[PDB]
Design a protein around this nucleic acid. Structure first.
Ligand SMILES: [Mg+2]
Ligand SMILES: [Mg+2]
Ligand SMILES: [Mg+2]
Ligand SMILES: [Mg+2]
Ligand SMILES: [Mg+2]
Ligand SMILES: [Mg+2]
Ligand SMILES: [Mg+2]
Ligand SMILES: [Mg+2]
Ligand SMILES: [Mg+2]
Ligand SMILES: [Mg+2]
Ligand SMILES: [Mg+2]
Ligand SMILES: [Zn+2]
Lengths: 99, 114, 224, 211, 127, 82, 100, 146
RNA sequence: CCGCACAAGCGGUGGAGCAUGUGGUUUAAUUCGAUGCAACGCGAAGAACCUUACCUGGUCUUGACAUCCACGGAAGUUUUCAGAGAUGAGAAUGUGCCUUCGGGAACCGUGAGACAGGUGCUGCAUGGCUGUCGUCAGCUCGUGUUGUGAAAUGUUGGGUUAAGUCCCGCAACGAGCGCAACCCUUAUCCUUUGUUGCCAGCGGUCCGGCCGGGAACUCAAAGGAGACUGCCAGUGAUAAACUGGAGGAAGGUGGGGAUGACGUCAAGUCAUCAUGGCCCUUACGACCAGGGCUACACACGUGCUACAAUGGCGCAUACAAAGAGAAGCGACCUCGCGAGAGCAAGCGGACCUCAUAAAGUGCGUCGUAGUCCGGAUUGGAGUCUGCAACUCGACUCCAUGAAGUCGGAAUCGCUAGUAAUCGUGGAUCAGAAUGCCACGGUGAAUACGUUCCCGG
């Protein structure tokens, strides 16, 4: 009875336009939205030997931060499920719909 | 008192005193005491023959002192006599379990030379 | 200005007899109490003939630069320039202020850019500490070029107080051919002043007399 | 000393990525591998079409690429024919339905890729590197940059020594993270060998985040 | 009634709810003196109340997360103080000059590369 | 030691050659590369050459050798002091 | 490195793939308790008959661009260098310098 | 401190007996940030001082420390051409610190089956102004004026 | 005038044992590079096979890899023999698809040479990358001025700053590269949203946040808000600045990052790659097996563990952060002394799991000893990974218990949440951490200062 929507992207700005679009669609069909809920973003560190060959003193550190949002609607109607399936997003984002 | 072994245990706790006997470590020493059902901090003194007999028994169940030394010496000996690789090493007094002979093997190698 | 008008203000006053310049002998009435006394008989007609030239320049749309860097008389000279819609230098005369005109124009542009930017916005985009620093830079550019932001080009006439103190300015002017009008105390070298006014340059009262008379005649020249 | 790569540092600040697809650790490496390969191939193809940028965004059921160049009609031919065969070859080098898009650039002198490659080409004409890069920076500045800096390195003028050099003009703040510095590197293969060229163009500071 | 103060320390976070009436104090449904196996902690948690002296006047149901014991105690003292304040605000001056409304921020430093620790350097043989 | 649930280890072609030698009466010291094989009891009172890395050395097998691997009897290094 | 090495690893992968199920069931039988321990015996024998390339241990991760085994990043499948390349240019999506 | 002089951060007093000089002393005895196991021994020594040497153990501390806290110091430096063992004076905090150091090490000098025994009995001897810490104060005054 | 430069501090190194590198030595081979600062737990974030370039041997010659040409076969699947395998030798089955039927595509096999191939040489032919001075405070420019000019000024003086930082002086003025700031993160608050997170007040509850229920808080993460010498006083040109005070979560560039101007060093790398030139080509190319890269009279760095009663040991018991996870993490349960095994839930993960932090604390215990210290070494027996643990894995069990009792000359590291200690995680990775990169627990001492040391 829950329609749960996990969004995973790389920048918060995009994931947020995504959540905004989602909730405004939910309010097209007037679905019962729980809002965008911010989940703990995930951090990926990578230390690498930038210096080529023997030099090891030089080192660099890069990061990948996966931003993660959660939305849900407790009251699905048709106008919910169809339209939410009629939803396009920027390729930067990722959707997971569970029912 | 006598534990049927060449060495004589000291008047310290029984598990430690049994550990002193060759071929009897902490595990085996406490296990012999558990078989005898004897308390721990009792030492070699303050314990009658009525226990020393039992102890000499339950340790006679094991091999200790010279007899164990003969068994280990023969296992190292024949292993040398097989002409096996580790036999070679034991003949040369070098580490037999794969350590650096390039450096810091003195524990087996001994002192240092030019 | 009449000789009586000057004398009450003290225009006749001068520097010590210990400190005078050789070319000033014709303009010196004499000495009293080891003090050089300036002769108003020369001072008044020369000032009037200079006022004639200043009126002429301002009556042909001239741009006038009032120059004085005395810490006492800075505000007097600034207000004097404001009273006749002209341009001024009331703090340290930067070397090459006129000869290096291009750099001053770039500095004028930065002054204008900062004030325009604050009105336009984007100060909120800047950090509050940065926005305060930008305001301090605008204040610094105002304390440096408040008088000449609107001069537009090189001035048509210069008025100088204590020509010896401002000697770099007169050297520049002569190098540009821009005329120099200057109050010249006995210790100054009068070669650089094409219309030379020998008179006290420190006393606030006589300085204000010079400035007020010049500004009245400049407004008169503008009015036509 | 060794600077830091100016493009990478401003990523997200004022520099968007060149690849926007999201993925997971499962399909990550192969995904970027496909992207690399299609980049490489497209470069090879448009080697004369003056491509400045190739951005690749991968939707779940499709792959979409956008070319920043200045020679669109060159890439288009008639009715997007070569474009469509490109769509084919990239769809299959990606194994996924393709979507070719082209967003030409207007001021070719005002990128960092096109100018650098132009410099390399003229170096292959053995044009005087000096006057070549001079032309470059004149054109850029005259066009409206806030600063330009070129730099060339290695066995210049076919010399038997690697007397490198650099030329600068305008204003190039290389520590102000607020500033866009289009920086691109390229190479040139002389008979005498390989010579490197780096180009920075500072086009004013960005106010207001990534927007 | 119900007065709440939030205390943070190097790694621990506190949730302090006070009610006017006693001096009993409970932490994670344990009792302080037994909760902390070191007396200095009991001290440093009594500090605020021990100072304003309204100890057995209002009792405490505090909560704590993360960090070691000292972090707990610090977060506790801070929370306590920030509750006292929100409860009277006459003791603002008092607690501040007592060094309690500080919000200590001394935290551990990340390990930096080329260093055996955050700031320790490898034993380089200059010779 | 590898394990016991998997029992010992030995190449199959070792089994081939060894049982051929067995059934066929004594043979030549047979050539072998697999030091990693395990000595089996049936293979006793015979000999076998094993490639130490640069040549196959001979070793006359006997019972007590069982359990050890063929490699121990081919010292792949040469040393007599500094 | 040498194209010989790259193709070598490639062939190792392609090989060890096709025998996946066989190795699987064989190791199953072997490890399996209660087996005849004869069927286990000839089972492991049959196992070793397979090509030595079938073992996953032979497979060594290599950069897909420069054929370099060392400094491999399982997340990107590149060397410890070309990663920096595709990073500073901005091809690795969402990647950037880390200074926490 | 080539540009500006900074010292140790200001400390907070030990709450157990209100004294920060206690707190400083224990931070001198504190090994490897192990406060608890350290303050244990100082408390164990002061409590037994408080009986075997009259009451007021907080005051037994100084009746020993005054007996140890040196007055003259030797600060060698080449402001005169080479190393010069010059006798000078220090502010009270420095001699306090030196006294605390000298007793805590004198404690480590003895063992006696437990640290409590060492520290307690040696602080007693220092209260008596005889022993090693007081004695190495006598010696530092001896070499200096020599 | 600066700098953990010294001083003042603490804790080491140098002594032992081991780990690890390097050199020497040896080797059939111990592949290559890296060489004072600024090479020596360095390339390598992980050599049993593999990797691997080395040796020994067995082999192949348009070739392992690529295009092109022919010519023939679907592709494959299944299997046998010989070999150590490469490999040959076969034996079966399949012989599929587009085709406008001519063919193609598809692969594979033979030939054909063009050719492919090289971890071959030259980092003094190069690119690219990096170290180093050094996050050192500098670097210069337009213009102006002075000079016939080479130039100089700015940029110097007084100050002051972490700083060419800033004021003042100043024929200079300005700019630009630097510095600073914009960025990340941490310290306060508010706003928004509250599930898998949360529980103040709520009713039930088995009393477990568990759960109808609460949205406050803790958190979570997006937005904001905040610190500016802003305020006070005192100093100093009154200036800059400085000292103190207030207030404040924070105070004087809050904390930590990232960020490296010119240029230096024919610095380093032709074995990541790219590339000039040269050199090999039935071989310096290619394949397989085994061996080596792990060798020991040695020397040297780097580290680890220790020499003990602030201790060791038994029992009991509390508090973390940061992570990772699907040929994966793997619970629970059962078996096993244990390493583990079996069984098998769960989880692509605020949920499931790795996983119960250790020091701490409580009690007992040990009595100063080569010890209930220390644990190397050797025996024995197991386990697990993996074709495969002999050379040469990790680990468990039993037994064994060296040297070591704080280490000369000398030398190193650090100004606080640091040092020092205590554990946790990750990368690489089938497996293989005292190394590396992270996270937290606890948590010091000293700084009169600039005489010297050393560098600037
Ligand atoms: Mg592997
Ligand atoms: Mg080299
Ligand atoms: Mg080489
Ligand atoms: Mg060189
Ligand atoms: Mg071999
Ligand atoms: Mg090696
Ligand atoms: Mg070391
Ligand atoms: Mg112990
Ligand atoms: Mg001892
Ligand atoms: Mg290391
Ligand atoms: Mg820590
Ligand atoms: Zn005058």
């Amino acid at each position: 009875q829950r329609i749960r929507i996990r969004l995973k992207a790389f920048d918060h700005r995009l994931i947020d336009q995504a959540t905004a679009e989602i909730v405004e669609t939910a309010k097209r069909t007037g679905a019962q939205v729980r809002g965008p809920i911010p989940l703990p973003t995930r951090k990926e560190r990578f230390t690498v030997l930038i210096s080529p060959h023997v030099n090891k003193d030089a080192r660099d550190q890069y990061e990948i931060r996966t931003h993660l949002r959660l939305v849900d609607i407790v009251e699905p109607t048709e106008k919910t499920v169809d339209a939410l399936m009629r939803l396009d997003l920027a390729a930067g984002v990722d959707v997971q719909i569970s029912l | 008192a006598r534990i049927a072994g060449i060495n004589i245990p000291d008047h310290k706790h029984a598990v430690i005193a049994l550990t002193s006997i060759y071929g009897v470590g902490k595990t085996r020493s406490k296990a012999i005491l558990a078989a005898a059902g004897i308390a721990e901090d009792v030492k070699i003194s303050e314990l009658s023959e009525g226990q020393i007999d039992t102890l000499r028994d339950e340790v006679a169940k094991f091999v200790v002192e010279g007899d164990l030394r003969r068994e280990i010496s023969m296992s190292i000996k024949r292993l040398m006599d097989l002409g096996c690789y580790r036999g070679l090493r034991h003949r040369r007094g070098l580490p037999v379990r794969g350590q650096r002979t390039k450096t810091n093997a003195r524990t087996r190698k001994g002192p240092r030379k030019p | 200005v009449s000789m009586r008008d000057m004398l009450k203000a003290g225009v006749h006053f001068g520097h010590q007899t210990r400190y005078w310049n050789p070319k000033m002998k014709p303009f010196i009435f004499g000495a009293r109490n080891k003090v050089h006394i300036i002769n108003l008989e020369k001072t008044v007609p020369m000032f009037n003939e200079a006022l004639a030239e200043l009126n002429k320049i301002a009556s042909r749309k001239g741009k006038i630069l009032f120059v004085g860097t005395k810490r006492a008389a800075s505000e007097a000279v600034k207000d004097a320039a404001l009273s006749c819609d002209q341009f001024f230098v009331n703090h340290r005369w930067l070397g090459g202020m006129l000869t290096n005109w291009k750099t001053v124009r770039q500095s004028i542009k930065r002054l204008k850019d900062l004030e325009t930017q604050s009105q336009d916005g984007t100060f909120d985009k800047l950090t509050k500490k940065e926005a305060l620093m930008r305001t301090r830079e605008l204040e610094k550019l105002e304390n440096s070029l408040g008088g000449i932001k609107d001069m537009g080009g090189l001035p048509d006439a210069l008025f100088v107080i204590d020509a010896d103190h401002e000697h770099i300015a007169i050297k520049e002017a002569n190098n540009l051919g821009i005329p120099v009008f200057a109050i010249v105390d006995t210790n100054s070298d009068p070669d650089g002043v094409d219309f030379v006014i020998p008179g006290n340059d420190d006393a606030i009262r006589a300085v204000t007399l010079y400035l007020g008379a010049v500004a009245a005649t400049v407004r008169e020249g503008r009015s036509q | 000393g060794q600077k830091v790569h100016p493009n990478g540092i401003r990523l997200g600040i004022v520099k968007p990525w060149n690849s926007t697809w999201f993925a997971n650790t499962k399909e990550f490496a192969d995904n970027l591998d496909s992207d690399f390969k299609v980049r490489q191939y497209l470069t090879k193809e448009l080697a004369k079409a003056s491509v400045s940028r190739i951005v690749i965004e991968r939707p779940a059921k499709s792959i979409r690429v956008t070319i920043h160049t200045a020679r669109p009609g060159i890439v288009i031919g008639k009715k997007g024919e070569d474009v469509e065969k490109l769509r084919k070859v990239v769809a299959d080098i990606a194994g996924v339905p393709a979507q070719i898009n082209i967003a030409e650039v207007r001021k070719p002198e005002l990128d960092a890729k096109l100018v650098a490659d132009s410099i390399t080409s003229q170096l292959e004409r053995r044009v005087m590197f000096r006057r070549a890069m001079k032309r470059a920076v004149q054109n850029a500045m005259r066009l409206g940059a806030k600063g330009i800096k070129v730099e060339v390195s290695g066995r210049l003028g076919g010399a038997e020594i690697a007397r490198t050099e650099w030329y600068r003009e305008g204003r190039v703040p290389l520590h102000t993270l607020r500033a866009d510095i289009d920086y691109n590197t390229s190479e040139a293969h002389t008979t005498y060998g390989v010579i490197g060229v780096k180009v920075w163009i500072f086009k004013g500071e960005i106010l207001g985040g990534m927007a | 009634n119900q007065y709440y103060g939030t205390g943070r320390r190097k790694s621990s976070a506190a949730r302090v709810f006070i009610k006017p009436g006693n001096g009993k104090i409970v932490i994670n449904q344990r009792s302080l003196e037994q909760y902390f196996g070191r007396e200095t902690a009991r001290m440093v948690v009594r500090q605020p109340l021990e100072l304003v002296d309204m100890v057995e006047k209002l009792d405490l149901y505090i909560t704590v997360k993360g960090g070691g014991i000292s972090g707990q105690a610090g977060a506790i003292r801070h929370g306590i103080t920030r509750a006292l304040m929100e409860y009277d605000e006459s003791l603002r001056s008092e607690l501040r000059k007592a060094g309690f409304v500080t919000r200590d921020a001394r935290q551990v430093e990340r390990k930096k590369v080329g260093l055996r620790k955050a700031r320790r350097r490898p034993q380089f043989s200059k010779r | 030691p590898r394990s016991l649930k998997k029992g010992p280890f030995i190449d199959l072609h070792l089994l081939k050659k060894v049982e051929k030698a067995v059934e066929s009466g004594d043979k030549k010291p047979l050539r072998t590369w697999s030091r990693r094989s395990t000595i089996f009891p049936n293979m006793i009172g015979l000999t076998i050459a094993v490639h130490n890395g640069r040549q196959h050395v001979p070793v006359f097998v006997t019972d007590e050798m069982v359990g050890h691997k063929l490699g121990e009897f081919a010292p792949t290094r040469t040393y007599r002091g500094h | 490195a040498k194209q010989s090495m790259k193709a070598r690893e490639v062939k190792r992968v392609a090989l060890a793939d096709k025998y996946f199920a066989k190795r699987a069931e064989l190791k199953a039988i072997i490890s399996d308790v209660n087996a005849s321990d004869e069927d286990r015996w000839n089972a492991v024998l049959k196992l070793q008959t397979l090509p030595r390339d079938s073992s996953p241990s032979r497979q060594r991760n290599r950069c897909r661009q420069t054929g370099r085994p060392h400094g491999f990043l399982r997340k990107f499948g590149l060397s410890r260098i070309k990663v920096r390349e595709a990073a500073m240019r901005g091809e690795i999506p969402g990647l950037k310098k880390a200074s926490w | 401190p080539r540009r500006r002089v900074i010292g140790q951060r200001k400390i907070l007093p030990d709450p157990k007996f209100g004294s920060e000089l206690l707190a400083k002393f224990v931070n001198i005895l504190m090994v490897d940030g192990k406060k608890s196991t350290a303050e244990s021994i100082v408390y164990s020594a002061l409590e037994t001082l408080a009986q075997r040497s009259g009451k007021s153990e907080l005051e037994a501390f100084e009746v020993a420390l005054e007996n140890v806290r040196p007055t003259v110091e030797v600060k060698s430096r080449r402001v005169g051409g080479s190393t010069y063992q010059v006798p000078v004076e220090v502010r009270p905090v420095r001699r306090n610190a030196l006294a605390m150091r000298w007793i805590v090490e004198a404690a480590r000098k003895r063992g006696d089956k437990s640290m409590a025994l060492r520290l307690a009995n040696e602080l007693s001897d220092a209260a008596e102004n005889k022993g090693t810490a007081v004695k190495k104060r006598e010696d530092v005054h001896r070499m200096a004026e020599a």
